Amino acid sequence: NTATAYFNVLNAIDVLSYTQAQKEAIYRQLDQTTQRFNVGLVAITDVQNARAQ
Amino acid sequence: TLMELRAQRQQAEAELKLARVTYSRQQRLAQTQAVSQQDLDNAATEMAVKQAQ
Amino acid sequence: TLMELRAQRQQAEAELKLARVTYSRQQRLAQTQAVSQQDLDNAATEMAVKQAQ
Amino acid sequence: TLMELRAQRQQAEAELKLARVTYSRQQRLAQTQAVSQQDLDNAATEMAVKQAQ
Amino acid sequence: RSVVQTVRSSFNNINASISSINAYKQAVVSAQSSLDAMEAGYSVGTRTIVDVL
C-alpha cells in the first residue's frame, strides 16, 4: 500500500502539469478563433465551440 | 452568329438565376448571422460577375 | 471542318445525357425532400447549360 | 467593343473588392498571429493580381 | 484519519461538481446556437430535418 500510494502522487503530478499545458494551448486557440470572429471570418457557433473547449 | 450568341446569352441567363437565388438564400439566413460576412462577400460578388457576363 | 463540328457536337450530346440523368435522379429522391433544394438548383442549371451548348 | 470592355472592367472591379476585403480581414487577425504568414502571402499576392487585371 | 480523508474528498467533489455544471451549461448554449443555425439552414432548406435533430 505504501509503495502504491507513493507512486500515485507522482502520477497525479504528471496529469496535473499536462492538463495545464493543454489548458494554455486550448486557451490561445480560443483567443485566435475569437479574434477571427472579430474580423468576421467565421460563424459565432465556432466561437462558442472553442468556448466549450 | 447572332443565333450563336442568342444561345450563349441564354446560358448566362441561367447562371445569373443560380447566383441570385444563392445570394438571397444566403442573406435570409444571414440576418441570423450566418457564416459571417465571408460567404456573403463570396455571394454578393459572384452575382456581380454573372451580372457583368 | 463540318466533320470537326460533327464530332464536337457528339461530345455535348453525351454530357447532356449525363446532366439529365443526374437531374431526374436528384428529383426522384427530391420528392422525399432530397439533400435540400440546393442540389436541385445545382442540377437544374447545369442541364440548362448543356442544353445551350 | 468599348461597351464590352466597359463591363468586363466592372467585373474585375468587384473581384478587386473581394480580394482586398479578404486581405484586410486577414491582417486584422494577423496582428494576433493569424493562421501563419502563409495566408498573408496567399492574400497579398492575389490582391496584386486583381490590381494588375 | 479516515473521516478527515473522507470529508476533504467530499468538499473537493463538490467543487468538481460546480465546475462541471459550468462546463455543461456552456455546452448547452453552444449546441443550442448551433441548432438554431442549422434550423436557419433548413429555412431555405440547405440541409435535412434529421440533421436538425
Chain B residue at shortest CA distance from D5: B52
C49, B17: Cβ pair inside 8 Å?
A: no
Cβ D14 vs Cβ B45: under 8 Å:
yes
Q: Is E35 on the interface with B (CB under 8 A)?
A: no
- A48 — contact with chain B (CB < 8 Å)? no
Technique that determined the structure: cryo-EM
| Residue count (chain E) | 53
Whether E53 and chain C come into contact, CB under 8 Å, resolves to no
Identify from E39, E44, E47, E52 which residue to disrupt to test chain B contact, counting B C-beta atoms within 10 A and taking the largest count. E44
* D contact residues 4-43, partner B, Cβ 8 Å cutoff: 7-8, 10-11, 14-15, 17-18, 21-22, 25
Nearest C-alpha neighbor of B29 from the set B21, B51, A49: B21
Q: What is the rounded CA–CA span in Å between residue B12 and residue D52? A: 26
CA–CA min distance D7, chain B (Å) = 6
Which of chain D's residues have a Cβ under 8 Å away from the Cβ of A39? 25-26, 28-29
Other CB atoms within 10 A of residue B22 CB = 19
Contact with chain B for residue A38, Cβ under 8 A? no
Q: Where are the beta strands (DSSP E) in D1-53?
A: none
Chain B, nearest residue to C45 by Cα: B14
Q: Where would I find the H helices in chain C?
A: 2-30, 38-52
Rounded alpha-carbon distances, angstroms, from residue E46 to A46, A51, D21, D47: 19, 26, 27, 32
Are E48 and C36 an interchain contact pair (Cβ–Cβ within 8 Å)? yes
- List chain E residues with CB under 8 Å of B21: none
What CA–CA distance (Å, rounded) separates B41 from B51? 15
| Cα(A19)–Cα(C7) distance, integer angstroms | 67
Residue identified by cell 442544353 is C51
Resolution (A): 3.3
Rounded distance between C-alpha atoms, residue E2 and residue B42, angstroms: 66
Tell me which H or E stretch contains E4.
Answer: helix E2-43
* Spacing of C-alpha A47 from chain mean position: 15
Q: Are E24 and E18 in contact (CB under 8 A)?
A: no
State the Cα–Cα distance between residues C10 and C36, nearest whole angstrom.
Answer: 33
Instruction: Report the gap between the CA of E26 and the closest CA in chain A (Å).
Output: 6
**C53 has a chain B CB within 8 A of its CB:** yes
The packing angle between helices D38-52 and D2-30, to 10°, is 160
Chain B residues whose CB is inside 8 A of the D7 CB are 52
